[PDB]
Ligand binder design. Structure first.
Ligand code: YKL
Ligand SMILES: OC[C@H]1O[C@H](O[C@H]2[C@H](O)[C@@H](O)[C@@H](O)O[C@@H]2CO)[C@H](O)[C@@H](O)[C@@H]1O
Ligand code: CL
Ligand code: CL
Length: 515
């Protein structure tokens, strides 16, 4: 498609102050004559990369900063270049959340962290620990109430508990190879949650709407939610407090902290209008107030307005929880991490998998991109140069090593046996440079991904990749090999994610072709 020139289309999630944002849109229109349309489509964070890839979608996309590195890596976002005067009006750490490969890829809006929200008329003093919640629920059940209800369908809400005793996404000291999804800490956290469900203190089917309705109707004493939820609680007239999340095994719950951010679509012909809107209408005291009055933003990036908002105890509590938590990475692998952990929590909560089974799969899913890249990059580069990479494999190194040696055996068999067809494709594709390499993804998707899924055809995908890498070296295009490896890996892990996790990833590969 093609984005329409001379207006702005904005996407923002359905839990945010989109009516307030439209009010800012109307102010923009009054000055400029430019119509601003605000939409809140379902699953917009999944829809955006799909539609933006074809040159379509909104001019401006709002989401937490974690999704934006993936969008930027895919070429879907315009670089943001505000002047010093504007940059200095927002907190430096908020700009850090929207920096990717040394470039700003969005405007930061507000800092979001989950807090414990409690009904003061049911629980005058909230529990300091997760461990006391079962007993509290038993006490409340005798009054026809429950202790706690929160969204169990999105791992964002369960993550603070998983991370408490030592669960982590990607180690920070980031070591992207070091994933902490199936360690003792993560298992302890998720087992506690599953035990709450087993003991009928929570229901595995509880989602955002169910938890919100139960808290706002006075049926449950506590919920876990962000600043955006406070408006509906205000309307309900529940006498509520916002406080520090309970501890688990004596340690703070560690929410993953988000920075609501606004990115500009790389395909937009309205980039100057978008910049003007965001800098001089939205990111002002009046603009943010308009949004905040609809649904609270949390701790805003704009220093001048945050000085007012920081006096609110609910914002103090938000920032207390934020400081105990961690700012989310914006690495492209966050989407896969979230999908992996989402499935794990849901499956463990429903009883479809045990906690061990669930987190094992989540670990495999979260490691999949980087492990696949290590194997594929190494094979392509050693095939092209004739010499192996001496660098340590790192995390899950036996698997990588054994997958690579398996690939050497089976892949060299494919290349030899199918040399003529490989030569025919190589010449027909006519790959000369980094631009021609960029075009191969669509062809790989059409030929590899649409065909039957098995380890044989995965070996062909990679082996032809090695054949191309050899050619690139020969023609003094050795710099194209790593981009090629990244492209093959993306195609493999994106299109065959679910199948790969079912095989136990590269351990399945090694087993399948064992001599
Ligand atoms: C017991 O059985 C086996 N054990 N083991 C170990 C393997 C098999 C086995 O049977 N495997 S197999 O089923 N595999 C495929 O079909 C297959 C799988 C993945 C592929 C892939 C194919 N692709 C086309 C191939 C390349 C050579 O000619 C292709 C061919 C033959 N076709 C026939 C149709 N014609 C139409 C006109 O243009 C030429 C084209 C050539 O694909 C069917 C082929 F030879 C496959 C041989 C495999 C061994 C069969 C390469 C692609 C698309 C091109 C771009 C591109 C770029 C990179 Cl970097 C990387 C990859 C690619 C995607 O990856
Ligand atoms: O549940 C995984 C999900 O978590 C975060 O999404 C949050 C978002 O940051 C909040 O603004 C609010 O909308 O709640 C969401 C959870 O439903 C991540 O930002 C997101 O990428 C991830 O998929
Ligand atoms: Cl128009
Ligand atoms: Cl899949």
């Amino acid at each position: 498609g093609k984005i329409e020139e001379g207006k702005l289309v904005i996407w923002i999630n359905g839990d945010k102050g989109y009516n307030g944002l439209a009010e800012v849109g109307k102010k923009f229109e009054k000055d400029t004559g430019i119509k601003v349309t605000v939409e809140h489509p379902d699953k917009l964070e999944e829809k955006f990369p799909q539609v933006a890839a074809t040159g379509d979608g909104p001019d401006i996309i709002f989401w937490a900063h974690d999704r934006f590195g993936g969008y930027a890596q895919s070429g879907l976002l315009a670089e943001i270049t505000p002047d010093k005067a504007f940059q200095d009006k927002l907190y430096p750490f908020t700009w850090d959340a929207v920096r990717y490969n040394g470039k700003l890829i969005a405007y930061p809006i507000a800092v979001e962290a989950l807090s414990l929200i409690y009904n003061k008329d049911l629980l005058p003093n909230p529990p300091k620990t997760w461990e006391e919640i079962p007993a509290l629920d038993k006490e409340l059940k005798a009054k026809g109430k429950s202790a706690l209800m929160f969204n169990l369908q999105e791992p964002y809400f369960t993550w603070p508990l998983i991370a408490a005793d030592g669960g982590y996404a990607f180690k920070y000291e980031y070591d992207i190879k070091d994933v902490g999804v199936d360690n003792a800490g993560a298992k302890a956290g998720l087992t506690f949650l599953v035990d709450l469900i087993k003991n009928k203190h929570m229901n595995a089917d509880t989602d955002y709407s169910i938890a919100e309705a139960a808290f706002n109707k006075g049926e449950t004493a506590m919920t876990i939610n962000g600043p955006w939820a406070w408006s509906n609680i205000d309307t309900s007239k529940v006498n509520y407090g916002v406080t520090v999340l309970p501890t688990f095994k004596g340690q703070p719950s560690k929410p993953f902290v988000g920075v609501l951010s606004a990115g500009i679509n790389a395909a937009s012909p309205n980039k100057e209008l978008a910049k003007e809107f965001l800098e001089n209408y939205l990111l002002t005291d009046e603009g943010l107030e308009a949004v905040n009055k609809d649904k609270p933003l949390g701790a805003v990036a704009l220093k001048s307005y945050e000085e007012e908002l920081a006096k609110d105890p609910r914002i103090a509590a938000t920032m207390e929880n934020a400081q105990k938590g961690e700012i989310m990475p914006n690495i492209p692998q966050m989407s896969a991490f979230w999908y992996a952990v989402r499935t794990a929590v849901i499956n463990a909560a429903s009883g479809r998998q045990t906690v061990d089974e669930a987190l094992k799969d989540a670990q495999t899913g979260s490691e999949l991109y980087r492990q696949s890249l290590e194997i594929i990059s190494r094979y392509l580069r050693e095939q092209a140069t004739g010499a192996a990479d001496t660098a340590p494999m790192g995390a899950s190194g036996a698997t990588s090593r054994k997958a690579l040696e398996t690939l050497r055996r089976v892949g060299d068999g494919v290349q030899r046996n199918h040399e003529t067809a490989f030569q025919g494709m190589l010449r027909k594709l006519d790959i000369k440079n980094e631009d021609d390499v960029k075009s191969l993804s669509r062809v790989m998707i059409h030929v590899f991904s649409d065909g039957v899924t098995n380890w044989g055809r995965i070996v062909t995908l990679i082996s032809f990749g090695a054949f191309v890498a050899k050619h690139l070296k020969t023609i003094n295009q050795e710099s194209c090999i790593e981009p090629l490896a990244e492209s093959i890996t993306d195609v493999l892990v994106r299109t065959k994610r679910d199948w790969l996790v079912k095989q136990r990833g590269w351990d399945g590969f090694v087993e399948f072709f064992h001599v």
